[PDB]
Ligand binder design. Structure first.
Ligand code: 9Z9
Ligand code: 9SR
Ligand code: NAG
Ligand code: NAG
Ligand code: NAG
Ligand code: NAG
Ligand code: NAG
Ligand code: NAG
Ligand code: NAG
Ligand code: NAG
Ligand code: NAG
Length: 1151
């Protein structure tokens, strides 16, 4: 029959090509918002094609009872699904959802089985997850524990608001209040929102706690607890769901700076210990436990798979001879490499307001420089025939660019304004043959595009599917978020396809929240959370699998002088002298923390400092001189540890020699004294842990300068592109009084119109703080987009680039989001891959040199590791239980049963769920039932210990898990007892909660027997000393940068991220600000006030106490402080990741 012909038609590749074309046509047609009704054919033709494909399959391998053949393969289930859904829907619709268009999106996941590579990858991305199992359960366990702790500590503590004062009236029957307007009912008032105060600058409402360490309210405002939680109600810690989402955002580090700042501004600055604990414990150890598990697997499958894979005639010549003769000369190569360098430099000299001299030469520069290349190609064309000239993989390269460039310059009236110039740019890549690191950077782009080019295809398919699903589900709704005043919807919407692609990308780049929040207000919470969080788990898994993979691939492929010297050697050998020095170093360092804006007026201390200042230097000088004698000039000048102390004491001596003698406080001499900030640095030598860490970091310096260099050139391409695109297009008019937002483009469109309507001086043409005007000014902005912090203001201004020297417009240049999309993959994803690989390699080799020994670890810490590891590498053997007394001879058998263990372990889960039910604003009846139950529970538990103690005299204690337990119950028995004792105690709300929190300890009791957590948590215990050595280095570094910040960044305007409680006006406020920045969080808000010197935006001549005048921060030093810190912090936190990853690969791999 035709079945045998159906099999023939089944095996052809034309069938697969037709199926792929139909699927791609469907994908293109599905991305259209208001589909047109011409679709009588298409929805129907497709349905015909997809029915025909299933017909071909069932005719060839269908028949009857096909458990063995058709439909057995899991993928064909999708196909049948598609056909049934299709017909049912196309038939009629009566009282249904009718938004079942989203079901068609599933038709496009059929590409997976056809393109052959896709099916296997989506097969193995799925098997990866199966290995991240424990990690996902510990994630849930730790998230629940921290959610309970946050619930108890900040129960309803996010609602506090500064509200206008009220009085009670006493002329009306119920609670009545007044403030120029009588308002019936307290709650009618504590609710209305014209009675709350707007935080300066932001549009929020102030959050104000009553504790001393917390926000204080303005004069006419009392600070209470009434109203609706910030950010529309999704941030409060009132309920366990809201204390789980708001703490999972802390795990993923999404806008955690906003919650940190609001939480503390209501509960107090001491409560920053909780945040630190969440950020270290979870964001770091957890995220990394997952990356290591995802990695443990990729290697395993590739290792098994690779292993299993193993298992003219007169004269053309005399001068043709000549043409080659010039071409191959070694010096012919030098002229060339160098001419490349000059071009990049010549190019990177465009700027915003070039004087015409800089401009004409810039043109007279390209001609010469492109020309040199024309001679290189023609000579190289005359050298050999075109058969041999278009090969080897680097002649073609050159050939195209040379060709493209010549092309455009020719019209002279040529239209492309910029790329046209930057076509030349790619030449920079040519330095590759010479540069191993640029060669490695190119090989990675190539690998991802071509070889493991199936993973990126899978990622693109997933992103497309998620974008179309989100658009279809949520597009209709976002029309309300539209301001009907301006018909302006959000900048992030999902109404159209592109706008959607971007929300899906943002979610990939880390920024998922501000969007659930803006979609849960138009769409209803249940779905928004379901979809916008679905993109996350899958996506971050795919983006990570592609990344880990690219990396792995590169890896796979008088005679008394001689005794006077010894008598001063012995004082060095005497412990007491240098210990004095060590203490003197700490004290010396500390005394820096007291110089705040208020020391000027703390007289009794100001002076104390100075006596000490002097003595401090002397104790040291006596020490430098003592050393020079004891070890001589050789050892002191050759160790490079004494060199740092030498420079520090040099500048310290210059300070007092110029000041006291010279009576000179003029010019930069005081600026030299802002460098006493480094007195902390004396310490790095002294403490061994900080020392092994700094040695490990120094050993990696040569590679880091190369990796930092390639980025610098690569971002040079992006920076010159950005300068060429957005030069002079970031300036916007502002009416000042009315506000900080550009005026409309219809009212004022050109700068010539901006400065022609200033009859009343309110209009200021102010550029964006971070913009594209210089090549160097470009690189900051790129640091903001590449770190993802502050990038939104740059992206919102580039898209509005209406043109040169003219007002911005709302979305004139929408597609420039593409530039930003391109930089981020190459600039953030690929450059980072190189960074991580090289760091790992240097590290890998160092470990080998000192074989069997991690870096980041002292000698004494070694021996701990050695014993600690031994304890849990071997299980205990020989329990030896004894009946003992007949009195307990029938109790000890019951206490040891497995049934007893599981019922206890499930009573702990019952306690867990009865804990999860708390909430703010609970009725007396609820509060009441719940507390009685808490008493019941303590009781069962006290008892359990008791029977466990029946005759288990010695072994209750030696279990080391049982011993942990007594403590828990005692804390608990006390806890209940301590309950009514608080009455004679001050500040009653916060003493209580903390003792309540001991209840969580039971929660921690579940893991005696849950092995998965036990190995995984044990690991941290083995890694704890390494993290510590690095931590001290982070701290010493924070102090040094904190002192530097208070030196210059005090008295800066308070706007953006410098606000009253987080400012650089003292030590505590300075160190709080650094804590956010150490995670690169919110670092543009900190810096924007610094980079502000201006008649608008700041004010010259404010009168200031200590710093004496000026209210405007300095950009030149501020840009250096933050930019240097972001990098110093990056390299130090990255160091930690390796410490865990290798060590988690030391506990798991070992077993
Ligand atoms: C060759 O023999 C050496 C061997 C171990 C070598 O295997 C390596 C495989 C890659 C892997 C898992 C390793 C260490 C760091 C891991 C990285 C930490 C980074 O952290 C992240 C997340 C946070 C971001 C800031 C960027 O960096 C990831 C992208 C990066 C990461 C997860 C990419 C994958 C890396 C181990 C030792 O055997 C005993
Ligand atoms: N996860 C985020 N980290 C950034 O610190 C935040 C700042 O920068 C940014 O561009 O806009 C605001 C906020 O949305 C940000 N989101 C964006 O990155 C911001 O508060 C001020 O700009
Ligand atoms: C109640 O009314 C009396 C009238 O004499 C007034 O003096 C008193 O202050 C009022 N009390 C309150 C609660 O305001
Ligand atoms: C309380 O309000 C009621 C309703 O208007 C009013 O009738 C009554 O007089 C009030 N109480 C007094 C005694 O003022
Ligand atoms: C408002 O009442 C508060 C209550 O603490 C009080 O401190 C403040 O002085 C009052 N404001 C004015 C201006 O009276
Ligand atoms: C602050 O204190 C006042 C007086 O104790 C009290 O009325 C108010 O409830 C408190 N508000 C807050 C912020 O809890
Ligand atoms: C600026 O705003 C003020 C106050 O609204 C208004 O009166 C003034 O005309 C505005 N100036 C311009 C030209 O925008
Ligand atoms: C600018 O004003 C014009 C009318 O003056 C208005 O049509 C336009 O929408 C305004 N632009 C915006 C979006 O502010
Ligand atoms: C800017 O636009 C105005 C019209 O709004 C026009 O008259 C003016 O001459 C233009 N100036 C420039 C920069 O060409
Ligand atoms: C507007 O005119 C005032 C005159 O006081 C001036 O200070 C302000 O800078 C002007 N703005 C511009 C950009 O001309
Ligand atoms: C807010 O602005 C007012 C203006 O009077 C200022 O005095 C106040 O200190 C500012 N508060 C903060 C914290 O920005």
């Amino acid at each position: 029959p035709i079945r045998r012909a159906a099999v023939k038609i089944l095996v052809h590749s034309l069938f697969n090509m037709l199926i792929m074309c139909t699927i791609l046509t469907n994908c293109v047609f599905m991305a259209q918002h208001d589909p047109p009704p011409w679709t009588k054919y298409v929805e129907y033709t497709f349905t015909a094609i997809y029915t025909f494909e299933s017909l071909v399959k069932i005719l060839a391998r269908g028949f009857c009872l096909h458990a063995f053949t058709f439909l057995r393969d899991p993928w064909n289930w999708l196909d049948f699904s598609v056909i049934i859904m299709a017909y049912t829907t196309e038939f009629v619709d009566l009282g249904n959802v009718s938004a079942l268009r989203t079901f068609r999106v599933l038709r496009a996941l059929k590409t997976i089985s056809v393109i052959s590579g896709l099916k296997t990858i989506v097969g193995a991305l799925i098997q990866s997850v199966k290995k991240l199992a424990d990690v996902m359960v510990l994630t849930v366990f730790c998230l629940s524990v921290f959610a309970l702790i946050g619930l108890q500590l900040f129960m309803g503590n996010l609602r506090h608001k500064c509200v206008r004062n009220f009085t009670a009236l006493n002329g009306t029957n119920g609670s009545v209040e007044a403030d120029g307007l009588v308002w019936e009912s307290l709650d009618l008032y504590l609710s209305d929102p014209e009675n709350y105060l707007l935080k300066n600058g932001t549009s929020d409402v102030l959050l104000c706690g009553n504790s001393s360490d917390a926000g204080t309210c303005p004069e006419g405002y009392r600070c209470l607890k009434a109203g609706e939680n910030p950010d529309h109600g999704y941030t409060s810690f009132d309920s366990f769901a809201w204390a789980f989402l708001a703490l999972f955002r802390l795990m993923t580090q999404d806008c955690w700076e906003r919650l940190y700042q609001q939480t503390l501004r209501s509960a107090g600055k001491i409560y920053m210990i909780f945040f630190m604990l969440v950020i270290f414990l979870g964001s770091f150890y957890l995220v990394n436990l997952i990356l290591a598990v995802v990695a443990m697997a990729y290697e395993e499958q590739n290792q098994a798979t690779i292993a299993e894979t193993e298992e003219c005639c007169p004269l053309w010549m005399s001068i043709k001879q000549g043409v080659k003769l010039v071409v191959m000369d070694p010096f012919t190569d030098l002229t060339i490499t160098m001419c490349i360098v000059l071009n990049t430099l010549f190019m990177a000299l465009e700027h915003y307001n070039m004087t015409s001299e800089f401009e004409e030469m810039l043109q007279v520069g390209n001609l010469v420089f492109t020309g040199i290349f024309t001679a290189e190609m023609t000579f190289k064309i005359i050298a050999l025939d075109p058969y041999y000239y278009f090969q080897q993989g680097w002649n073609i390269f050159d050939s195209i660019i040379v060709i493209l460039s010549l092309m455009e310059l020719g019209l002279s009236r040529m239209s492309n304004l910029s790329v046209l110039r930057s076509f030349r740019l790619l030449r920079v890549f040519k330095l590759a043959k010479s540069w191993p690191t640029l060669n490695t950077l190119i090989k990675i782009i190539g690998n991802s595009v071509g070889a493991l080019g199936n993973l990126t295809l899978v990622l693109a398919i997933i992103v497309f599917i998620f974008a179309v699903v989100g658009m279809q589900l949520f597009g209709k709704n976002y029309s309300e978020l539209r301001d009907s005043d301006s018909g302006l919807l959000p900048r992030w919407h999902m109404m159209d396809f592109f706008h959607a692609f971007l929300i899906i990308f943002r979610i990939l780049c880390g920024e998922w929240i501000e969007t659930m929040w803006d979609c849960m207000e138009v769409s209803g919470q249940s779905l928004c959370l379901l979809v916008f969080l679905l993109v996350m788990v899958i996506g971050n898994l795919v983006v990570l699998n592609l990344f880990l993979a690219l990396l792995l691939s590169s890896f796979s492929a008088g005679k008394v002088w001689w005794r006077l010297r010894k008598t001063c050697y012995h004082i060095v050998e005497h412990s007491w002298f240098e210990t004095f020095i060590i203490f003197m170093i700490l004290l010396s360092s500390g005394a820096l923390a007291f110089e705040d804006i208020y020391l000027e007026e703390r007289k009794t201390i100001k002076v104390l400092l100075e006596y000490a200042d002097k003595m401090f230097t002397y104790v040291f000088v006596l020490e430098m001189l003592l050393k020079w004698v004891a070890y001589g000039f050789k050892k002191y000048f050759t160790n490079a540890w004494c060199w740092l102390d030498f420079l520090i004491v040099d500048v310290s001596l210059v300070s007092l020699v110029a000041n006291t003698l010279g009576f000179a406080e003029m010019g930069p001499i005081k600026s030299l004294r802002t460098l006493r900030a480094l007195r902390p640095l004396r310490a790095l030598s002294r403490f061994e842990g900080m020392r092994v860490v700094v040695n490990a970091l120094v050993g990696a310096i040569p590679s880091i300068m190369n990796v930092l260099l390639v980025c610098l050139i690569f971002w040079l391409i992006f920076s010159i592109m950005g300068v060429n695109l957005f030069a002079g297009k970031f300036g916007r008019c502002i009416n000042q009084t009315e506000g900080d937002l550009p005026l409309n483009y219809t009212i004022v469109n050109n700068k010539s119109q901006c400065e022609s309507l200033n009859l009343t001086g309110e209009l200021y043409w102010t550029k964006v703080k971070v913009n594209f005007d210089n090549v160097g000014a470009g690189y900051l902005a790129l640091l903001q987009v590449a770190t993802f912090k502050g990038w939104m203001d740059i992206m919102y201004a580039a898209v509005d680039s209406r043109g040169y020297e003219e007002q911005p417009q709302w979305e004139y240049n929408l597609y420039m989001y593409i530039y930003f999309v391109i930089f981020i993959i190459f600039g953030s994803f690929f450059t980072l891959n190189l960074f991580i690989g090289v760091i790992i390699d240097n590290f890998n080799q160092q470990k080998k040199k000192l074989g069997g020994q991690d870096i980041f670890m002292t000698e004494e810490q070694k021996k701990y590791y050695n014993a600690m590891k031994k304890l849990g590498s071997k299980k205990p053997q020989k329990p030896i239980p004894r009946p003992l007394n007949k009195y307990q001879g029938f109790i000890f058998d019951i206490v040891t049963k497995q049934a007893f263990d599981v019922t206890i372990m499930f009573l702990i889960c019952l306690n867990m769920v009865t804990m999860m039910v708390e909430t703010d604003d609970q009725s007396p009846e609820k509060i009441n039932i719940l507390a009685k139950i808490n008493l019941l529970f303590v009781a069962i538990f006290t008892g359990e210990c008791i029977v466990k103690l029946a005759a288990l005299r010695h072994y209750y204690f030696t279990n080391s898990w049982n011993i942990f337990d007594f403590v828990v119950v005692i804390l608990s028995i006390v806890g209940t007892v301590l309950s009514d004792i608080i009455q004679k105690y001050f500040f009653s709300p916060t003493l209580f909660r903390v003792i309540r929190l001991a209840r969580i300890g039971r929660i921690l009791r579940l893991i005696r027997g849950a092995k998965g957590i036990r190995t995984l948590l044990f690991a941290l215990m083995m890694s704890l000393p390494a993290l510590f050595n690095i931590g001290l280095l982070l701290f010493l570094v924070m102090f040094i940068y904190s002192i530097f910040g208070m030196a210059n960044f005090a008295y800066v305007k308070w706007e953006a991220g410098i606000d009253d409680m987080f400012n650089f006006q003292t030590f505590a406020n300075s160190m709080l600000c650094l804590f956010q920045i150490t995670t690169s969080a919110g670092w543009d808000g900190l810096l924007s006030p610094i980079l502000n010197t201006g008649p608008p935006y700041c004010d010259p001549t404010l009168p200031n106490s200590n710093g004496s005048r000026g209210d405007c921060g300095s950009p030149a030093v501020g840009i250096l402080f933050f930019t240097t810190y972001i990098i110093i912090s990056f390299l130090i936190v990255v160091n930690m990741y390796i410490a865990i990853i290798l060590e988690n690969f030391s506990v798991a791999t070992e077993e």
